[PDB]
A = this chain, B = another copy of it.
Amino acid sequence: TRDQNGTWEMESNENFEGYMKALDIDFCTRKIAVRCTQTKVIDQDGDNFKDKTTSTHRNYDVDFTVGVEFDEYTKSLDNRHVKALVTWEGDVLVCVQKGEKENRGWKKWIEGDKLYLELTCGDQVCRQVFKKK
């Protein structure tokens, strides 16, 4: 049939690299693009089409227990090995990431319907806010 209405999620994606190389996309973009999945939302009325695509990558899971130092490989970022230790400071979850980089850690806490995440490395602080979906 001719109706392509719906939300579609990618199952399979073959030779995406050759296609991208043929368009002269640089090596560093290609390396990231090939490990993504796509969702496609198609709204169609007669012969008018609206298409919204989003690309997604699932980083690896982290499982830990507060108080037990664990080994973590940050392969969603710099792919280094750090010894991480997570503890409560009040209701703030605090993690020190012992490794090559000095002063590497993060803090995580709930205030209202928002989750706050402060990432630190050296002198640089990154601040992320999440809302409950």
Binding site for B on A (CB under 8 A): 1-4, 6-16, 18-26, 28-29, 32, 38-40, 42, 47-59, 61-67, 76-78, 80, 86, 88, 91, 93, 101, 108, 110, 114-115, 119-133
The 18 listed contacts between A and B (C-beta, < 8 Å) are: A1-B91, A7-B132, A10-B129, A11-B114, A13-B126, A13-B128, A13-B129, A14-B126, A15-B126, A22-B123, A23-B121, A49-B63, A49-B64, A49-B66, A49-B86, A54-B56, A55-B76, A56-B56
Closest-by-CB residue of B relative to A93 is B4
A55–B55 Cα distance when bound, in Å, is 8
For the complex formed, measure the closest distance between the CB of A128 and the CB atoms of chain B, giving whole angstroms. 5
A119–B91 Cα distance when bound, in Å, is 51
Which DSSP category, helix, strand, loop or mixed, fits chain A's interface? Answer: strand
Contact: B110 with A3, CB < 8 Å?
yes
Note all chain B residues with C-beta closer than 8 A to A57: 54-55
A19–B117 Cα distance when bound, in Å, is 13
